């Protein structure tokens, strides 16, 4: 089924400025998007801001400014941040957008007509900071700004308040069996696996119905009104999750401005999401509520939700560290260092260690070696002579790599894709050391042709598979290698030997480097 590969980030609350959390989530989205574009597929990558709800309105009131002004400014800060970070996101959505509001109204109305929304009551705990309803088992004792004894969330540690409101309720309980069917028929639909297991356990235990509206006073009137009932506002999460549906229906001009909302998602071939990227902190909303809504509405379900080990929401400024160590370098570090855990060492020490050892010593070294005038005297891709068994072992690794990296990218597990490429880069480095092409220039020119050609091709293929991770440096590497544009994307070019011998290398600069090593 040919469609537009649809990949999303969460949309971020605008109560506060962009920080590393949002940059990381959106980086993952961006990397996935880029990989599928290099694969030759149509892609639509989505990110944006979550602008309604009690939390934002209280932040605005804290800053003594109107919610309208406040959201607009902070959304601008997010856009500027993602421009600075050099992403390639196709559209930036804001929930204040009038077309999004229309979509929310359609979806709400569909649920209501399907009999899945009734007027009832929520009486229980609520974390305003997480916009999350919580049962008594998810709360405990803690403290607030005052230092008074209060109740806090077990999920997040944020302060919880007791709510008692007549609310529109969504019949979430009715979807338990179907959600379980969905998880089991699609055992790759939630990644990583242990988070899939978490979701299943929770749903097995039982599902309550879910408040999908709140009284307008409670939200300081900063939300989407319920269709046919102005006293109630749409829950910030039903609002928020719907952004994915809205995005899938917006025609977008060359400047990234939304120009038109289509009636039928099928017109644009995006919905549903192939990959929803999220932090672990919002798994339940994406793996339980969201698909229940879609099931109620007769809409297709997303293929994959991937939940990373960070929270979606001692200073760590990504722009600052990118200006210090390089943008691609920082992106590589964030994607290499962290698995599906809030673990890994993000210190300057380890950043420099990975920069120096992996980027400079392994990749950069090898790029310079095979393009050096001392070794590559003719400044071109040589025609190989006959291959030894050792040559063939390296070639085999290079040939196998695209299929290996492809599976990892599709899981998705970007850390493993990176590790796989670098395993091949280490192997190529070892080969070069064993063959000592610098000695071969004088000794055996025929042998050098073979060695040089394999090395070049190894660098090309590894770099191609690293191009989603290192988008700018990949271009520099291809320029040095003289790889024509046409050979820089497309699955045809994953294949060993796509760049013919005789291809000239790009020009040299006197003292250039690819990655500058840094002091220890
Ligand atoms: C539909 S994704 C919403 C994510 C939420 N606004 C957050 O920042 O955690």
Automatic annotation (TrEMBL):
Methionyl/Leucyl tRNA synthetase domain segment(s): 6-370
Ranges in a coiled coil: none
Domain Methionyl-tRNA synthetase anticodon-binding: 382-520
UniProt entry tagged with the keyword Aminoacyl-tRNA synthetase: yes
GO molecular function list: ATP binding; methionine-tRNA ligase activity
One cellular-component annotation, GO: cytoplasm
Entry's Gene Ontology BP terms: methionyl-tRNA aminoacylation
Record EC number: 6.1.1.10
Highest rank taxon of the organism: Eukaryota
Positions of transmembrane segments: none
Keyword entries, A-Z: Aminoacyl-tRNA synthetase, ATP-binding, Ligase, Nucleotide-binding, Protein biosynthesis
Broad EC category: ligase
Family indicated by similarity: Belongs to the class-I aminoacyl-tRNA synthetase family.
Protein name according to UniProt: methionine--tRNA ligase
Gene source species: Trypanosoma brucei brucei (strain 927/4 GUTat10.1)
Residue numbers of the full-length protein present here: 238 to 767 of 773
């Amino acid at each position: 089924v040919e469609k537009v590969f649809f990949v999303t980030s969460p949309i971020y609350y605008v109560n506060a400025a962009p920080h590393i959390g949002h940059v990381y989530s959106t980086l993952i989205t961006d990397v996935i998007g880029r990989y599928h574009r290099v694969k030759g597929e149509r892609v639509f990558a989505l990110t944006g801001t979550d602008e309604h709800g009690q939390k934002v309105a209280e932040a605005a009131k804290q800053k003594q400014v109107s919610p309208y002004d406040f959201t607009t400014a902070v959304a601008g800060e997010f856009k500027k941040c993602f421009e600075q970070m050099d992403y390639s996101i196709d559209y930036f959505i804001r929930t204040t957008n009038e077309q999004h509001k229309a979509v929310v109204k359609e979806l709400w109305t569909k649920l209501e007509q399907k009999g899945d929304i009734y007027l009832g009551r929520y009486e229980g705990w609520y974390s305003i900071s997480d916009e999350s309803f919580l049962t008594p088992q998810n709360i405990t004792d803690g403290v607030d700004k005052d230092g008074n004894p209060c109740k806090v969330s077990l999920e997040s540690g944020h302060v919880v308040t007791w709510v008692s409101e007549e609310n529109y309720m969504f019949r979430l309980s009715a979807f338990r069996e179907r959600l379980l069917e969905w998880y089991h028929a699609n055992p790759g639909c939630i990644v990583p696996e242990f988070r899939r297991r978490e979701v299943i356990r929770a749903v097995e235990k039982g599902l309550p119905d879910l408040s999908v509206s709140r009284a307008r006073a409670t939200l300081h009137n900063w939300a989407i009104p319920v269709p046919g009932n102005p006293d109630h506002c749409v829950y910030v999460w039903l609002d928020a999750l719907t952004n994915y549906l809205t995005g899938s229906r917006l025609r977008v001009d060359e400047s990234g401005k939304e120009v038109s909302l289509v009636d039928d998602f099928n017109e644009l071939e995006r919905f549903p999401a192939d990959v929803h990227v999220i932090g672990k902190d919002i798994l339940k909303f994406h793996a339980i509520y969201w698909p229940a809504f879609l099931l109620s509405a007769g809409l297709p379900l997303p293929k994959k939700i991937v939940a990373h080990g960070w929270w979606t929401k001692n200073v760590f400024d990504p722009v600052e560290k990118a200006e210090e160590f390089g943008y691609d370098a920082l992106k590589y570090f964030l994607l290499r260092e962290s698995g599906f855990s809030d673990d890994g060492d993000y210190s300057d020490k380890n950043m420099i260690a990975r920069l120096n050892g992996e980027l400079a010593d392994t990749l950069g070294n090898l790029v310079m070696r095979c393009t050096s005038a001392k070794i590559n005297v003719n400044g071109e891709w040589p025609s190989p002579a006959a291959y030894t068994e050792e040559d063939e072992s390296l070639i085999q690794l290079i040939k196998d790599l695209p299929g290996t990296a492809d599976h990892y990218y599709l899981i998705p597990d970007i850390q493993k894709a990176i590790i796989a490429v670098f395993d091949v880069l280490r192997a190529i480095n070892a080969y070069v050391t064993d063959m000592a092409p610098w000695k071969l220039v004088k000794t055996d020119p025929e042998r050098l042709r073979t060695v040089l050609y394999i090395t070049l091709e190894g660098v090309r293929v590894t770099t191609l598979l690293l191009s989603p991770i290192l988008p700018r440096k990949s271009v520099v590497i291809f320029d040095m290698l003289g790889v024509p544009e046409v050979h820089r994307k497309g699955i045809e070019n994953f294949e060993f030997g796509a760049v013919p011998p005789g291809t000239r290398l790009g020009p040299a600069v006197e003292g250039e480097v690819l990655f500058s090593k840094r002091s220890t």
